[PDB]
């Protein structure tokens, strides 16, 4: 992770996907002043394992197409460093059931 004050030149940004399997992330210091995850409206997102995912799809008879999708650039998808294909399990409170579990696949 690279926490920058104001900017990262497009020269420097071109070196980001240059060294795989290792991965690089850029975070503007100003965004991080406040942890968005702590907000009233932001529920618990939990990243699933390859086996956990495989199981989800097995249990609901799903194709990755059929799952609700978290956008790759999503504030929380960023906070959790989610990769395309990765799945989150959202646990929200319900006025209906008390606790409701939803899932979102990464874009």
């Amino acid at each position: 992770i690279f926490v920058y004050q104001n900017n990262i030149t497009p020269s420097a940004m071109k070196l980001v996907p240059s060294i795989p399997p290792a991965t690089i992330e850029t975070f503007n210091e100003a965004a991080l002043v406040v942890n968005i995850t702590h907000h009233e409206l932001v529920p618990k997102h939990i990243r699933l394992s390859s086996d956990e995912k495989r199981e989800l799809l097995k249990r609901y008879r799903l194709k990755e197409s059929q799952l609700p999708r978290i956008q790759r650039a999503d504030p929380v998808a960023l906070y959790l460093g989610l990769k395309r294909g990765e799945v989150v399990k959202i646990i929200r409170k319900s006025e209906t059931s008390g606790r409701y579990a939803s899932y979102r696949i990464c874009m």
Binding site: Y60, L62, L67, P68, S94, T96, S97, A101
Partner: peptide, 21 residues
């Protein structure tokens, strides 16, 4: 399967109105 889906079988709600009632 108590799942709320569209013509694509894409899950909208996992269980109807989060309570299945």
């Amino acid at each position: 399967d108590n799942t709320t889906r569209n013509s694509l079988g894409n899950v909208i709600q996992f269980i109807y109105g989060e309570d299945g009632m």
